Amino acid sequence: SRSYPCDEKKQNDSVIAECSNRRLQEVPQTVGKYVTELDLSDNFITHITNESFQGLQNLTKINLNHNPNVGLNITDGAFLNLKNLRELLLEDNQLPQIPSGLPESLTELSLIQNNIYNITKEGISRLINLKNLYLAWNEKTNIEDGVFETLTNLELLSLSFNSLSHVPPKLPSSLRKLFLSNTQIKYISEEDFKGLINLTLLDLSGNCPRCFNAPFPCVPCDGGASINIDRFAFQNLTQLRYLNLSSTSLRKINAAWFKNMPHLKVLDLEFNYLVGEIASGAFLTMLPRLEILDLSFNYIKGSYPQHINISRNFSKLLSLRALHLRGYVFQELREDDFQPLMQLPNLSTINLGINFIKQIDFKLFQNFSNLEIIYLSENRISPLDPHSNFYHFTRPLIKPQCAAYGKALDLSLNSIFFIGPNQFENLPDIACLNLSANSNAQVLSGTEFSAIPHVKYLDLTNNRLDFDNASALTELSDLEVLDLSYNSHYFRIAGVTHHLEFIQNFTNLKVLNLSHNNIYTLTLESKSLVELVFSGNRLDILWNDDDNRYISIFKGLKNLTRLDLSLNRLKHIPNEAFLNLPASLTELHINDNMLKFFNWTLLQQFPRLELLDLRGNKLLFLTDSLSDFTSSLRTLLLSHNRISHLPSGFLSEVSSLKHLDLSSNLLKTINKSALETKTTTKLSMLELHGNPFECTCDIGDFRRWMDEHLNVKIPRLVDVICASPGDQRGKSIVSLE
Amino acid sequence: SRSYPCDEKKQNDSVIAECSNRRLQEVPQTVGKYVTELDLSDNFITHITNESFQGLQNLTKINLNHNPNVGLNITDGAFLNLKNLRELLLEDNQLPQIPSGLPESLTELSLIQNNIYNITKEGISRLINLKNLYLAWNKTNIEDGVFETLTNLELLSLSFNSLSHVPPKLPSSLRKLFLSNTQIKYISEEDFKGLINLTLLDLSGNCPRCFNAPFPCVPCDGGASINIDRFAFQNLTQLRYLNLSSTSLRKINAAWFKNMPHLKVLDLEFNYLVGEIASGAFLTMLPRLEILDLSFNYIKGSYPQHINISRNFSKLLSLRALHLRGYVFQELREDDFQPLMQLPNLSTINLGINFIKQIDFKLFQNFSNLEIIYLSENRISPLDPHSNFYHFTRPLIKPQCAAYGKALDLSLNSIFFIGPNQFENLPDIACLNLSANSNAQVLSGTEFSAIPHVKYLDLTNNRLDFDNASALTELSDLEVLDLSYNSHYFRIAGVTHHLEFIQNFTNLKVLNLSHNNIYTLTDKYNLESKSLVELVFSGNRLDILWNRYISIFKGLKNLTRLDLSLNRLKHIPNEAFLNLPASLTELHINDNMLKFFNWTLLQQFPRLELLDLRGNKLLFLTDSLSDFTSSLRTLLLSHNRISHLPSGFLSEVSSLKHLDLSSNLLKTINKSALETKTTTKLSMLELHGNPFECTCDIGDFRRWMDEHLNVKIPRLVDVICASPGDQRGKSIVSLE
Ligand SMILES: *[C@@H]1O[C@H](CO)[C@@H](O[C@@H]2O[C@H](CO)[C@@H](O[C@@H]3O[C@H](CO[C@H]4O[C@H](CO)[C@@H](O)[C@H](O)[C@@H]4O)[C@@H](O)[C@H](O[C@H]4O[C@H](CO)[C@@H](O)[C@H](O)[C@@H]4O)[C@@H]3O)[C@H](O)[C@H]2NC(C)=O)[C@H](O)[C@H]1NC(C)=O
Ligand SMILES: *[C@@H]1O[C@H](CO)[C@@H](O[C@@H]2O[C@H](CO)[C@@H](O[C@@H]3O[C@H](CO[C@H]4O[C@H](CO)[C@@H](O)[C@H](O)[C@@H]4O)[C@@H](O)[C@H](O[C@H]4O[C@H](CO)[C@@H](O)[C@H](O)[C@@H]4O)[C@@H]3O)[C@H](O)[C@H]2NC(C)=O)[C@H](O)[C@H]1NC(C)=O
Ligand SMILES: *[C@@H]1O[C@H](CO)[C@@H](O[C@@H]2O[C@H](CO)[C@@H](O[C@@H]3O[C@H](CO[C@H]4O[C@H](CO)[C@@H](O)[C@H](O)[C@@H]4O)[C@@H](O)[C@H](O[C@H]4O[C@H](CO)[C@@H](O)[C@H](O)[C@@H]4O)[C@@H]3O)[C@H](O)[C@H]2NC(C)=O)[C@H](O)[C@H]1NC(C)=O
Ligand SMILES: *[C@@H]1O[C@H](CO)[C@@H](O[C@@H]2O[C@H](CO)[C@@H](O[C@@H]3O[C@H](CO[C@H]4O[C@H](CO)[C@@H](O)[C@H](O)[C@@H]4O)[C@@H](O)[C@H](O[C@H]4O[C@H](CO)[C@@H](O)[C@H](O)[C@@H]4O)[C@@H]3O)[C@H](O)[C@H]2NC(C)=O)[C@H](O)[C@H]1NC(C)=O
Ligand SMILES: *[C@@H]1O[C@H](CO)[C@@H](O[C@@H]2O[C@H](CO)[C@@H](O[C@@H]3O[C@H](CO)[C@@H](O)[C@H](O)[C@@H]3O)[C@H](O)[C@H]2NC(C)=O)[C@H](O)[C@H]1NC(C)=O
Ligand SMILES: *[C@@H]1O[C@H](CO)[C@@H](O[C@@H]2O[C@H](CO)[C@@H](O[C@@H]3O[C@H](CO)[C@@H](O)[C@H](O)[C@@H]3O)[C@H](O)[C@H]2NC(C)=O)[C@H](O)[C@H]1NC(C)=O
Ligand SMILES: Cc1cc(-c2cc3[nH]nc(N[C@@H]4CCNC[C@H]4F)c3cc2C2CC2)cc(C)n1
Ligand SMILES: Cc1cc(-c2cc3[nH]nc(N[C@@H]4CCNC[C@H]4F)c3cc2C2CC2)cc(C)n1
Ligand SMILES: *[C@@H]1O[C@H](CO)[C@@H](O)[C@H](O)[C@H]1NC(C)=O
Ligand SMILES: *[C@@H]1O[C@H](CO)[C@@H](O)[C@H](O)[C@H]1NC(C)=O
Ligand SMILES: *[C@@H]1O[C@H](CO)[C@@H](O)[C@H](O)[C@H]1NC(C)=O
Ligand SMILES: *[C@@H]1O[C@H](CO)[C@@H](O)[C@H](O)[C@H]1NC(C)=O
Ligand SMILES: *[C@@H]1O[C@H](CO)[C@@H](O)[C@H](O)[C@H]1NC(C)=O
Ligand SMILES: *[C@@H]1O[C@H](CO)[C@@H](O)[C@H](O)[C@H]1NC(C)=O
Ligand SMILES: *[C@@H]1O[C@H](CO)[C@@H](O)[C@H](O)[C@H]1NC(C)=O
Ligand SMILES: *[C@@H]1O[C@H](CO)[C@@H](O)[C@H](O)[C@H]1NC(C)=O
Ligand SMILES: *[C@@H]1O[C@H](CO)[C@@H](O)[C@H](O)[C@H]1NC(C)=O
Ligand SMILES: *[C@@H]1O[C@H](CO)[C@@H](O)[C@H](O)[C@H]1NC(C)=O
Ligand SMILES: *[C@@H]1O[C@H](CO)[C@@H](O)[C@H](O)[C@H]1NC(C)=O
Ligand SMILES: *[C@@H]1O[C@H](CO)[C@@H](O)[C@H](O)[C@H]1NC(C)=O
């Protein structure tokens, strides 16, 4: 009773079917009639009939996006028999018209990225229970006069990326989220939103766009014109919380728009010409509950002012929590320039990226009572997907792991070619610092970070730092995470570089990333280190038969639990060197190397090793008695290797093994001696796709084992392809006699 | 009589044999006895005996570098029979000792990158005619007076050897002494008293400043520098070249140059001479110095406001090139460069990697013949053992650009937009490099008004906007425009790209629009130019354009060279191909996905000499190429899927001198294709990498190779047989 081709799974007393991206030519009839949610996206399905989902009467959600994957002939009333269907997704299907005969039960319909030009009452007005309707990316969109009027339960109407030219009349009063982005609406009137008194979101972005790095076609509003919003256009939107007016070429903001909007929480004014409006800011007094204000990329092309002209009225934004001021472009940030922002109590984020600031007076950040994120990346500071927000930077400015430690300052991608003596003077108690991609060739000695000694997460990636001095970075006593990835040394001394003895002077350093540092010579000991990433280095050079000085390289890291030794060009690991690894290791990664052999016997000296990663290697053989070497290995990843034979009893050897990855190997068949179930194992997953399975009668022994052991979940059944013979080539091993 | 495996060639009434990089297991005996110079480098040769070069009695030069290529067992007196041998090169051979029994006739011996630890009189003292001796990259035991008998020794290079001391008893005839990275910490008065004719002295790398060293670097323990005695160079009157780079020098003694009036090149890079540059007492002792390099002399952690240049710099009357990289200073002022302004020959100022926040550009008008101003890798804001390991020898600015006149290189700076006062108060600039600045200037026709005589403008690696019809048109005399790797930052749907600015140039000859991601053109969809000669359109999307842009390049009537490579072209429309400039003499449609090519269309291009269709997926050729072209001198079809050469193809076009058919799917060449009814001037035919079926079917072509010796077939060792097993790997010319 193994499910094929869908991957059935239990989810809150229900069964979901993950049947996506598996080259299905037609809707499969081998789906259990008890499933509730069906996902058939990214397949080659071409026809949808009334007898496609027969028997599956409990289907509450159907996904049919991207079909055929790089149109879709849906018959009239094909989904009418599904009386319990609530969510129907039909995106990127090249649908010429809205599917006729849709079920009345529908509460969520998505028709994004189709060829729909007519929004008629014939295909929409019958769906009276619709909560969310998405008609994005579809000469002019013909919308029926009062097509949405009958949808009394409509909460979300998204008509973005459609040449509407005008706001559609007769919208339901129940509407809460109206999306009209890039809809060529050049004029907004008083009567346009009077009916929707419960609107919590209004998206008018992209109408009269400012063509700057647009991720889609951009055409300005002819004659430098902006969106023409009427004075009383938003006079009856009392419950408005989200207002997106990005890329609207706005030059003046009318304060009368926000006089009857006391709950406005998020205001997006990015990609506009509001340098003058930021300096005067009469509209800022009308926003006493605004929490997020984005005024990014509002620069005047060719204008490089000495300072930023921030209005005094910015002090009236009492509820402000985050201010995004990227792309303003100014040469200097002085203490007096940010005076109207220091008294704000909840302001914890200041975004100032891509401003080309030659120098910032860092003494002003002490005045901000509750700052937590100071994003100054991509400046000139010197030593000493249709379901996305296309205009706002939604990804966290500073990595959550870093910002979690406290005060976060991002000085990455600046002109800090060395750490000056007054680099961090007069700064707050910074606990997260980013100095990435600064080409910083500082010779660290132990006094550079004395002004901010409580840095717990330090990012020094993509630099040319020199940490050979035994006291480098040791001034940061409470340091826990150190990132030195992609560090190309600049003062390499023959009998000195690399000298990693600075690590021993840290009582609480937990994570260290020395990846891609080109470490091929040393000249390590730690009581608190837990994870070391040594990938992208030259361990093959360090582990040679001439000098055996690097046999006990990581033996001093007694508390180490995670070690990444990938991408080290390791052809062979000396047995003595492998045995001198931390016995406390619970996760070892020797993937993406050139390991021809692996001594499985040595695993005896690591009784807590749970995850062994040997992917992307050139291994050929496995051991006959893995139980005799490990009694804890829960996961063993051996994908992309040259293993051609599974040894006798391998599946029953280690009883603690729950995940075994053998995908993309050279396995022709699995013999009955390897499947011997004398003992009971808890193998919950076995990957085998990409193997050249000989689909003759020899594979029959393994086929029966799959049906007997249903608990061993084998993923990607459609990708477990038979390489021989011709008639069975391409087909799955489970589709045989 | 076709030469194999060497490539014999005439050179000034002599025969040279290019027998390099051909996987030779042993010295070949199939070399014509009349050859003079033999090159057997980068091969797998393991043994050298007295009967290896037998018969080749006229060998004046033998090269045996890198053997075996990634040691060399040379017998005693293996080269003694070669009485005319002058130049013997034995580099990277893992030679444990200097080869014994070397011929007395030798005038040039190179033993670089070997395991030679003893320089004994047994293997050197007999060679009395040696002009040049190279013993670099080999403690080193040097015999007391081993070089004393070499009365004709002009060049002695003992660099990259742990010598510790200058070898005693060197010949007085020495003119070029090389002692770089030799661990010589002390230099005395008696060390160079014997060599009165020394024109070059290299003491670099002794007590090195470990900064970005290209080889192992160990400082002189205790921050010490090279200890040069006061009177160490008191008898080197003819010294012209002095290299003291990476010597950790902090003070330069002026008494060193009191008896050195002809010193021309002084290298002081990678030192600690910031204080010595400010006081410069030694600068008065150099009235004929032409090249002064003081690069990478910065104090680590020191970022001064200005550069402290000594007043004594004005006494360097003969100075023509000053290299001041890696000093690291925030601001260049007119006052700081006052000592250099009255020098009558100063033509080059190197100021790269200085992190200068801003320069007062009106100081550059104060020079006499300032031809090169290199300011790359600064912070200016809007408005191989045979190499010089310490000096930047490659031209600072491309020769093609600097030849136009005064050249200013402002690449890799902080100029994110061309400010209004970006070029005000600058000299009459003829070459301008604004590369890799992330310049997002919307060019309108007034940005370069202060320097309107720019003839070669390099605007590569920027985010420029040239959609305005009057962009760059202020540079009336513009000849070369380089817009490579330009990522449009303000792409307007019905406007970008708009290349109508090109038509307003009366003398624009070369335009490089490579990798600009040009997949859409507007209004004047077609480009028009009366003076353009070369257009590089590679790295664009011509497949999208040709899938209303049929006559895209038809307006460039004077165009002779066109590069349409890397355009993801699967099929070129016949109408579009015919609407190409008829004046084209060189077309490059290589590195695409062309399945078919209409050879018939070549009739409308009577001046086309070079057709490049490499790296494509072509399968067939035409039966009557003579009927379509009467000028095609070169046809490159390498890396394609051509499996059959049509009948008479080699005799069709008589003007064809070079035909490239390498890395194709040719199994054999039939006798109908080799039909020589007419006489052709095919001087070269490439065929390596083809899966040649080395059966009796290849015999027809083998005879044609011997009959037509004028058709030179290069890389004979790489024309490998794919079948059968016994002939697999072997060359097609090594068959019965
Ligand atoms: C103009 O400005 C407005 C306001 O900022 C923007 O509106 C936002 O638009 C985005 C994209 O359309 C919306 O994001 C999506 O929200 C869905 C609902 O989220 C709620 O529910 C989930 C639980 O179901 C909660 O976790 C969540 O916190 C919310 O309470 C999500 O289901 C979506 O997720 C899917 O897409 C993302 C991105 O691809 C994936 O990472 C997810 O895994 C998942 O597949 C998505 O996050 C957002 O909610 C809108 N805001 C509001 C308040 O409605 C406009 O987009 C903007 N216009 C332009 C053109 O920029
Ligand atoms: C230098 O080396 C360091 C150390 O390895 C790297 O830092 C780590 O990077 C990894 C990613 O590469 C981080 O792991 C990720 O953490 C995310 C957040 O985890 C928190 O939140 C979840 C709940 O949302 C908690 O369960 C968790 O305990 C944490 O509190 C996860 O969401 C990520 O999960 C994704 O990947 C895993 C596989 O790795 C999947 O199984 C998941 O389904 C999911 O797709 C992921 O685990 C890790 O946290 C970082 N550590 C630190 C200390 O920062 C640096 O990135 C590296 N530097 C460079 C330049 O490469
Ligand atoms: C310290 O400073 C001194 C002085 O600057 C440096 O000395 C120079 O060292 C280089 C490298 O050893 C020398 O360069 C070589 O010169 C050979 C001779 O050149 C003359 O003859 C040819 C004609 O035969 C003329 O064209 C030329 O103008 C000269 O008159 C060349 O034959 C060499 O060429 C070969 O190598 C180069 C580079 O790989 C290739 O491009 C060529 O194709 C060819 O294969 C080479 O150019 C230079 O001549 C020395 N100067 C003097 C005045 O002798 C020291 O090297 C420096 N020390 C350190 C450690 O940096
Ligand atoms: C954007 O596009 C432009 C135009 O194509 C590029 O500029 C040209 O770049 C090529 C190289 O890619 C240049 O060609 C080279 O010129 C050298 C100088 O030529 C003169 O000097 C030599 C003697 O030193 C004379 O023999 C010659 O006749 C000229 O007077 C040559 O030395 C080079 O020759 C070598 O390569 C060729 C094959 O390419 C061999 O046949 C030769 O034997 C030799 O090995 C070569 O010809 C060309 O001069 C540049 N033109 C201009 C106007 O500058 C840009 O580089 C490109 N930009 C980017 C970023 O790619
Ligand atoms: C410290 O600052 C650096 C520099 O800004 C941060 O590095 C940047 O991190 C982001 C997110 O990981 C990278 O962006 C991603 O790039 C991939 C590949 O193009 C893309 O698929 C993702 O969607 C996303 O855009 C970015 O490339 C990277 N930049 C550099 C220069 O490394 C770093 O994350 C910051 N560290 C902390 C602790 O916050
Ligand atoms: C204008 O300024 C730019 C930036 O300084 C110059 O580009 C640089 O040119 C050099 C020489 O062509 C490049 O170096 C070469 O790289 C190749 C490939 O690695 C190598 O084979 C050569 O030996 C040499 O090192 C360099 O990469 C390139 N840098 C960039 C950022 O493009 C440009 O040449 C200048 N143009 C003019 C007209 O002066
Ligand atoms: C005409 C003009 C242009 C710019 C400008 C130039 C620019 N050049 N490069 C920019 N950004 C690159 C990509 C992101 N990372 C940094 C760089 F690589 C950039 C941004 C910008 C304005 C958005 C701030 C500023 C002004 C006043 N006027
Ligand atoms: C401790 C210290 C370091 C530097 C310095 C930093 C640097 N950061 N990055 C440098 N150069 C990279 C390669 C070339 N291109 C730009 C970058 F990529 C570089 C050079 C340098 C000294 C040679 C000038 C300067 C000073 C006073 N003190
Ligand atoms: C649908 O689900 C209900 C339980 O919610 C169950 O009683 C019924 O048998 C299911 N019907 C089908 C066709 O699976
Ligand atoms: C700050 O945020 C908290 C919720 O995190 C809220 O209770 C408080 O009232 C806010 N303060 C102001 C002044 O808006
Ligand atoms: C805060 O700013 C005020 C002026 O706005 C100044 O008087 C005060 O000293 C500053 N304090 C700190 C800690 O920055
Ligand atoms: C190492 O750092 C210490 C502390 O700053 C300093 O005193 C010492 O001179 C440095 N030593 C080296 C070898 O750089
Ligand atoms: C090992 O690491 C953990 C986490 O950093 C730490 O709490 C623990 O004290 C360390 N154990 C020893 C023995 O140092
Ligand atoms: C594993 O290593 C031990 C030494 O640590 C050695 O005796 C044994 O033969 C090795 N086994 C294999 C299969 O290499
Ligand atoms: C060597 O060259 C001379 C002419 O310079 C010639 O007469 C003689 O025959 C040549 N010898 C050999 C062996 O080729
Ligand atoms: C300048 O250089 C030229 C040769 O290019 C030379 O004739 C002239 O005398 C030099 N002038 C001085 C003052 O050295
Ligand atoms: C040259 O500099 C002098 C001062 O040294 C100044 O008076 C003169 O105007 C400058 N001329 C030019 C063309 O820069
Ligand atoms: C084009 O450039 C001209 C000349 O600078 C300017 O007057 C005009 O406004 C620009 N037009 C556009 C469409 O950018
Ligand atoms: C073609 O180009 C050359 C070189 O730029 C130029 O000299 C010639 O006058 C041009 N011919 C015509 C007809 O414009
Ligand atoms: C070449 O193009 C012409 C039209 O320009 C067409 O008639 C002819 O058939 C084409 N030949 C091939 C082989 O495609």
Side-chain angles (χ1 to χ4, degrees), chain B residues 48-54 75-80 82:
Chain B
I48 297 298
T49 78
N50 61 342
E51 306 179 33
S52 292
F53 304 107
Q54 48 170 208
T75 70
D76 293 42
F79 306 96
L80 201 60
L82 305 153

Side-chain angles (χ1 to χ4, degrees), chain A residues 211-214 216-220 297 299 302-304 329 331 354-356 358-359 382-383 415 417-418 421 442-443 464 489-492 494-495, chain B residues 210-213 215-219 296 298 301-303 328 330 353-355 357-358 379 381-382 414 416-417 420 441-442 463 488-491 493-494:
Chain A
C211 298
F212 171 65
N213 205 24
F216 33 71
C218 184
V219 273
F297 301 105
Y299 73 99
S303 183
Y304 201 13
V329 185
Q331 308 183 35
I354 324 110
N355 269 325
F356 302 98
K358 301 176 185 187
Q359 212 53 252
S382 314
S415 312
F417 63 102
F418 79 85
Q442 181 69 28
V443 178
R464 296 189 139 272
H489 215 287
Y490 218 5
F491 323 90
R492 193 181 294 257
Chain B
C210 298
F211 171 65
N212 206 23
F215 33 71
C217 184
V218 273
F296 301 105
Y298 73 99
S302 183
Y303 201 13
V328 185
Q330 308 183 35
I353 324 110
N354 269 325
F355 302 97
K357 301 176 185 188
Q358 211 47 241
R379 294 293 170 259
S381 311
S414 304
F416 58 101
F417 83 92
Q441 183 65 42
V442 186
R463 300 169 153 276
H488 206 285
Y489 214 11
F490 321 89
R491 194 181 293 257

Side-chain angles (χ1 to χ4, degrees), chain A residues 453-487 489-492 494-495 498-500 502-503 505-544 547-570 572-595 598-611:
Chain A
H454 304 113
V455 169
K456 311 218 185 175
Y457 191 119
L458 186 61
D459 200 295
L460 304 179
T461 60
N462 306 285
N463 280 309
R464 296 189 139 272
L465 286 144
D466 189 344
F467 40 84
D468 293 341
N469 189 306
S471 64
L473 291 169
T474 66
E475 67 266 42
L476 304 168
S477 306
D478 301 317
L479 189 63
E480 288 199 355
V481 184
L482 185 56
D483 214 341
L484 285 156
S485 315
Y486 305 98
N487 224 249
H489 215 287
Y490 218 5
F491 323 90
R492 193 181 294 257
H498 286 257
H499 192 75
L500 312 174
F502 73 102
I503 300 164
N505 204 71
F506 287 102
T507 66
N508 229 321
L509 180 66
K510 301 174 178 174
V511 175
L512 175 71
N513 189 330
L514 282 175
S515 73
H516 304 98
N517 280 35
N518 195 33
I519 302 171
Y520 61 90
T521 170
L522 294 176
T523 56
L524 290 94
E525 289 89 10
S526 181
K527 299 181 192 172
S528 63
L529 202 75
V530 166
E531 175 186 22
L532 172 64
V533 180
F534 212 70
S535 54
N537 289 320
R538 298 298 305 275
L539 256 179
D540 62 320
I541 298 183
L542 292 164
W543 287 332
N544 68 94
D547 73 83
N548 285 132
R549 299 171 297 177
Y550 313 107
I551 288 298
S552 52
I553 177 179
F554 316 112
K555 212 179 185 179
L557 316 178
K558 305 293 198 67
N559 210 34
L560 194 82
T561 76
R562 186 178 190 271
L563 178 62
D564 184 21
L565 305 174
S566 58
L567 306 160
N568 272 272
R569 307 188 208 183
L570 290 172
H572 70 299
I573 294 176
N575 294 339
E576 200 189 31
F578 190 86
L579 287 171
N580 285 15
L581 283 177
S584 54
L585 283 174
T586 68
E587 184 165 334
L588 183 62
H589 289 255
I590 335 170
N591 66 309
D592 295 324
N593 276 285
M594 274 132 271
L595 293 168
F598 183 81
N599 198 343
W600 303 93
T601 308
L602 311 179
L603 301 174
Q604 273 203 18
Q605 314 306 307
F606 305 101
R608 303 187 274 262
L609 184 62
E610 303 170 358
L611 167 57

Side-chain angles (χ1 to χ4, degrees), chain B residues 268-284:
Chain B
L268 293 160
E269 56 269 19
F270 304 94
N271 279 312
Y272 307 99
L273 306 162
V274 152
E276 270 299 319
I277 284 169
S279 73
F282 70 103
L283 297 162
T284 67

Side-chain angles (χ1 to χ4, degrees), chain A residues 169-189:
Chain A
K170 305 178 178 187
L171 297 177
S173 66
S174 72
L175 255 179
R176 300 216 170 199
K177 292 193 189 308
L178 178 61
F179 290 93
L180 300 172
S181 186
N182 288 262
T183 51
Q184 305 189 32
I185 299 178
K186 310 177 170 49
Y187 181 72
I188 294 295
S189 64

Side-chain angles (χ1 to χ4, degrees), chain A residues 218-282:
Chain A
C218 184
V219 273
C221 249
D222 185 80
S226 65
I227 190 173
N228 209 267
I229 294 173
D230 195 38
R231 176 173 189 87
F232 306 105
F234 316 138
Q235 77 167 136
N236 284 133
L237 306 175
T238 55
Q239 308 298 312
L240 200 64
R241 262 83 175 183
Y242 305 89
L243 182 60
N244 199 341
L245 292 164
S246 321
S247 214
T248 50
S249 297
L250 281 173
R251 288 183 159 85
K252 183 150 81 172
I253 306 299
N254 185 22
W257 297 336
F258 323 96
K259 77 185 175 311
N260 308 308
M261 205 177 292
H263 301 276
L264 194 63
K265 188 165 65 177
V266 173
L267 181 59
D268 277 29
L269 293 160
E270 56 269 19
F271 304 95
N272 279 312
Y273 307 99
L274 306 161
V275 152
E277 270 299 319
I278 284 169
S280 73

